[PDB]
Design a protein around this ligand. Sequence first.
Ligand SMILES: CN(C)CC(=O)Nc1ccc2[nH]c(=O)c3ccccc3c2c1
Length: 179
Amino acid sequence: DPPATVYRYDSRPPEDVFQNGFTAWGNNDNVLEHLTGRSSQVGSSNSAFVSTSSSRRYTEVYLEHRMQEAVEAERAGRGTGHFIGYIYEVRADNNFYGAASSYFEYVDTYGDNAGRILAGALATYQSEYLAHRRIPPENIRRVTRVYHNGITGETTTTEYSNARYVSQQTRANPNPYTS
Ligand SMILES: CN(C)CC(=O)Nc1ccc2[nH]c(=O)c3ccccc3c2c1
């Protein structure tokens, strides 16, 4: 039963995301390259997928890693220590494809003699959903803004809804992504 709702941590604020949605980095729709990172590398940032998770908690884990990175950067003199991260709640539709399922389909076709995802990561990927090319702003319901002052340790959480959100009865695609 594919999720009707997924979540995405992003550093981009709602003035950007609620107007533009999320857009992928390039036109490379190779699922294995997205999941392993080949299509996310500097000099190689061309994936056609926008990642989301059906687990809000997992997006909070992502946010909290980035928060700690900002705290550590300030301690080292490479940042202000003022971190802002955002968790977006997104309506999934047939343009959203399960990562684990898409991986298994990729392997069934091309094998794994070379590119192989470890079991621990693949288990996380059961909750990862890949939106092809973009997530329109009409799919984005609301945002949670998390501010953290690295120097004082103080945090706030604030909520805003997206006026452009369009309600529809959709859920993620039940099938793997195929190129
Ligand atoms: C590290 N950058 C080159 C790429 C990047 O920032 N990716 C990115 C950026 C934001 C992301 N946000 C998520 O919620 C998420 C959830 C599951 C898997 C990945 C993500 C996610 C990934």
